[PDB]
Scaffold this active site. Sequence first.
Site, mmCIF file in Angstrom:
data_model
loop_
_atom_site.group_PDB
_atom_site.id
_atom_site.type_symbol
_atom_site.label_atom_id
_atom_site.label_comp_id
_atom_site.label_asym_id
_atom_site.label_seq_id
_atom_site.Cartn_x
_atom_site.Cartn_y
_atom_site.Cartn_z
ATOM 1 N N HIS A 174 9.433 -12.779 -2.084
ATOM 2 C CA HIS A 174 10.794 -13.151 -1.697
ATOM 3 C C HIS A 174 11.163 -14.412 -2.444
ATOM 4 O O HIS A 174 12.184 -14.472 -3.145
ATOM 5 C CB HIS A 174 10.912 -13.404 -0.191
ATOM 6 C CG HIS A 174 12.336 -13.616 0.275
ATOM 7 N ND1 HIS A 174 13.107 -14.643 -0.179
ATOM 8 C CD2 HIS A 174 13.109 -12.900 1.138
ATOM 9 C CE1 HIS A 174 14.313 -14.572 0.382
ATOM 10 N NE2 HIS A 174 14.326 -13.509 1.193
ATOM 11 N N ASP A 202 0.802 -1.209 0.000
ATOM 12 C CA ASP A 202 0.000 0.000 0.000
ATOM 13 C C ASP A 202 0.841 1.268 0.000
ATOM 14 O O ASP A 202 0.297 2.375 -0.057
ATOM 15 C CB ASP A 202 -0.940 -0.006 1.204
ATOM 16 C CG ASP A 202 -2.396 0.086 0.798
ATOM 17 O OD1 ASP A 202 -2.983 -0.962 0.432
ATOM 18 O OD2 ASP A 202 -2.947 1.207 0.839
ATOM 19 N N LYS A 232 4.424 1.047 -4.654
ATOM 20 C CA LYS A 232 5.572 0.979 -5.550
ATOM 21 C C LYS A 232 5.039 1.254 -6.946
ATOM 22 O O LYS A 232 5.612 2.030 -7.719
ATOM 23 C CB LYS A 232 6.177 -0.420 -5.511
ATOM 24 C CG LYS A 232 6.305 -1.013 -4.117
ATOM 25 C CD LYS A 232 7.120 -2.310 -4.139
ATOM 26 C CE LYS A 232 6.273 -3.563 -3.946
ATOM 27 N NZ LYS A 232 7.083 -4.631 -3.289
ATOM 28 N N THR A 233 3.923 0.578 -7.228
ATOM 29 C CA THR A 233 3.038 0.769 -8.381
ATOM 30 C C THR A 233 2.934 2.219 -8.878
ATOM 31 O O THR A 233 3.145 2.513 -10.065
ATOM 32 C CB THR A 233 1.622 0.226 -8.025
ATOM 33 O OG1 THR A 233 1.085 0.915 -6.870
ATOM 34 C CG2 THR A 233 1.699 -1.268 -7.722
#
Length: 1203
Positions: free
Chosen positions: A344, A302, A305-306
């Site tokens: 990850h 949230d 990065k988008t």
Amino acid sequence: AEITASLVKELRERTGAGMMDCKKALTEANGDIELAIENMRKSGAIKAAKKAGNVAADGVIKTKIDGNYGIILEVNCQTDFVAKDAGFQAFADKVLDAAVAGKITDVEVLKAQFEEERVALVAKIGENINIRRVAALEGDVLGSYQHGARIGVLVAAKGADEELVKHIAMHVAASKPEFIKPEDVSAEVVEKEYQVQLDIAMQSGKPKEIAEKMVEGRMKKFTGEVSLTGQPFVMEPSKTVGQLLKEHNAEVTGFIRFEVGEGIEKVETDFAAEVAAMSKQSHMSFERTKPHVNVGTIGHVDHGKTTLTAAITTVLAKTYGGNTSHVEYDTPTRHYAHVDCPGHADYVKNMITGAAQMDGAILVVAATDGPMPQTREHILLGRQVGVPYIIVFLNKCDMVDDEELLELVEMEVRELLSQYDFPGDDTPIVRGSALKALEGDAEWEAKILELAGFLDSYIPEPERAIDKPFLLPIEDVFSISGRGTVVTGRVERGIIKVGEEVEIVGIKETQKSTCTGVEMFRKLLDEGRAGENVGVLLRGIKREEIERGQVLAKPGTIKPHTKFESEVYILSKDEGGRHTPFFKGYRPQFYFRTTDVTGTIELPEGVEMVMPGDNIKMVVTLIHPIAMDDGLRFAIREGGRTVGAGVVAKVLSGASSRNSLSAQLRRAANTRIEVEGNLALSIANDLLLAYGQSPFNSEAECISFSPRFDGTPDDFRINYLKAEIMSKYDDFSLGIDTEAVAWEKFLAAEAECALTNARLYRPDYSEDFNFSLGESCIHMARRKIAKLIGDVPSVEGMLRHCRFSGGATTTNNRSYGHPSFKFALPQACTPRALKYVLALRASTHFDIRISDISPFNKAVTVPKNSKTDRCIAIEPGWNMFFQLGIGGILRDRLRCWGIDLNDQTINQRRAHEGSVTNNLATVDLSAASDSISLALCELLLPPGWFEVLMDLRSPKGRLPDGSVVTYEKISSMGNGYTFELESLIFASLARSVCEILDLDSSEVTVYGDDIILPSCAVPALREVFKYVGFTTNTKKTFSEGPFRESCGKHYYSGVDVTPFYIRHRIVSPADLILVLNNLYRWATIDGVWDPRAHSVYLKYRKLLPKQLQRNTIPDGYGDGALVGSVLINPFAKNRGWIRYVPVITDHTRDRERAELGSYLYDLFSRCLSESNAIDQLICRSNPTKISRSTGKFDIQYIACSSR
RNA sequence: CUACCC
RNA sequence: GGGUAG
Ligand SMILES: Nc1nc2c(ncn2[C@@H]2O[C@H](COP(=O)(O)OP(=O)(O)OP(=O)(O)O)[C@@H](O)[C@H]2O)c(=O)[nH]1
Ligand SMILES: [Ca+2]
Ligand SMILES: [Ca+2]
């Protein structure tokens, strides 16, 4: 600025909430502590319930046991990083031992018993941390194996201990059974598929106890699969678990297995897709030597990065200019490549398999809330995957009104970096908002400019591979008289100039030598740059001292080792790898640069099984050294197939099949078997009876029996195979037949071809009045051809398509067929065709040997039917070289009409449709390639093409009859372009017959002569072909039938009826292994026999030697053995946690290769390379070896799998 | 150099 | 000859 930024920290480090969620819950708390936290405590469930449109796909499983009371869990988040962090761990561990004390089965119970604490963390983190499921099992002895985090299994036994319940829980973890016994099903879930297949089956026309038998057996297998009973124990997949259990003193009761995200389905998010959409909104309101830098974006979900990667696109569009799921954008100095780091464990499966490395990651953290708790796992993923450099961007800073408070968050990230040995003190941190930069707010657009100003500086310029210490992978070696020793390969790194000193390091004592010189195919250069495909001359060193996979680098640049630590990903089941996990003693081959190398592995402390679709650290110790350094991608092959990938991490200190068995088989493999007659005719007969169908009485009826085209698919399938199986039996006794008949036809193929060639030269009827359908199509085809083709073959497309290939030339023969014996030996050219070979000769400094110069090709005969043969023709080896080049440009080009010839799928799939649809018709001509007029070909092809076809073609042919013929057919079978031409010709005309009838020409598909078109066109296509000379194989052309056949697939009402043929006389056990196998495929569905075929399989199976009846293999592995269940194979040995099996091979004494011509070819290949599960690019091409089929059969060992 | 086919 | 899997 409102209240002091100071003790907002007092909130954070006593709470853990957001930065501004703390200051804003203090601005309405009157500078108080507790009552500020009580806002958070009450306005923490509001955000906690804001989490519900956030799907939780990740998480953990945890497991506990006391005495004999066991419990599992499925507490889950929406992100890896969270699950692996010391918070989600603490809560989930707590919520696990809460079921230890209290046997809580109702999840509702503890889902509520911590709801007031479940919020304490989602307020702290920012993800729908919710428990999914829980269950527990009591019993005698109950064991539990935990596969790291993702998979948990609880299983309960009896008579078993840690030397078992561990090992079987591993199997349950590995194999994933839903039930435990074949008897553990509902007679409703059973009689579901028992009524679902019964129609599927009976619709075919197969009786009572055929379908019933078939279905029951198949369902018996289906049950048997999921049957923990009927399941091959994962550590001994020879014996079943259920068998292992009864054979042991024991008996399990129950089992629980959870994975993570079962059913939690969701929809796959692409990154580069949605970021082009996050941009599209804001859209509406020379120097190519510039380096590549792989950057990644990493941080909370949230924190968007988008949003930032989008700004770093548009603002870079605004200013300068412009492996999928990545964004390609530029900068005035550099050119980046940018990816998301959500998983990850899915970023490792990106670094290891090299789909996306990292030259510098970007650390996104929203300033409003600052470092999340799980961020130390983001930073941990950096100093875990060895990311070099890290830049941090604080997104959303408008949401703070006090700089004195922003400067406090850098404290709580600069110190979080430093715990992980990253330059926290000296690391760049940009404060800004992407949201403002998406708009047009240039005051905040200067921040993305301040960020991209760091990727330009704080990230180092990648050592461009030219500049790295020279190195070449030895791919092959040749001993030229005149040159000594030469190796070829593309040079990986660096430059090699003539004379420099090089080492030759690989397996032997890293010898050293000197570059006597370098050369390509055309050029004989003096320096060898990286990325180029070359051949380097070495002196004072012969071939036998140089293996393959050796490297050829600067001295001391890279030492050879044999012990190293690495990290590897193992291809999942669905990805190509093993569908079976391995354990402590895995012994695969390690495909390194060019050669495969076997080797043992250690498992790190505490891991004991690894499964397909895993990451994993391990220590590799391979059998004999290869030259290496850190950063070396190696795949991992198991019997030729790649089931792993991995990169060396740190290079270290340095450090059962019965031979009697193989030799027993070799004995029996050569066992010629003896029969009281024709074994085939016997088998086929004794098979027809096995189906009610009336058998052959004589040996003539084998090829004079025409099937019927009515009846159920079953009444057909068999009746068809009947008329088909025997067709190709060469060895027919009073077959008063020959090959002379083959010649007798080839005479018409010119005798007719004559008639047309001539009468095809006067299309003025008498006076203009009559208008013929053919002529029109030709006219249309001609036009059509040339839009597709060109006025003349581009030499560009001509040179990179020509090749030396296959077998017999006029100068060679099947023995001397491999391409090296074409550069070595001089090949024949043809008068007209000279000019091209001369071009090749000024096209290189190599030797271009023209032997004879004649316009002759040898016409011969190869076997075909039992009633006739072929009459192929062996072309002048140079003509063949160019013919194959124009055969290739006329094929890559032919793909625009939707015609793919290296895919005969798209032409047999459509035979399927036709058999049902009835709107598609399969067609077949009588002497396809043979009846193509020199006349017709002239009328269609461009004059410029029709030159190059008259040039390359062989105009005259000499027969075995001594006698010569001058070709009326432009081109015969065996000619180097004839296939593509007749495709294109036939396609051309079908399509003209389409336009001519208001029909989609795109519905026309041609494969050589196997042309498929709309059923209505057929009588026109037929009348065209009647004109253009050809004649139509009424017997093999199918329009109104329930039946279509094309590209060797046959179909009857959508149903597969492809027969198999019994070609040559069955004698060696290899010829019976072969026939028994085709009947196995032809009458099985998933190892489940059509009963009445099984009868003869089983019968003639007795004919093979005792050991050669138990030796089974999976299908799709050859015919070196009977296909069956390799789980059963007694001769199948378990080496290195991979099963190996013995199969019949053909014997090969080796032979001498032309070091000249092999080298000539190897470097000619690189001319054709150079002008033409994301890890097969690692694997290279093979050295030339020649070998001669002896007659004996050897037994070779290979690698296998279950299903 | 084994199978399948146009 | 040519694909396709060995
Ligand atoms: N050059 C060449 N082409 C072949 C060979 N075998 C099959 N073909 C191709 O396959 C196409 C059709 O093969 P078939 O259908 O078996 O034979 P056909 O000569 O065309 O005619 P019939 O078998 O009599 O119906 C021909 O046009 C050929 O181009 C061969 O050995 N050499
Ligand atoms: Ca044909
Ligand atoms: Ca055909």
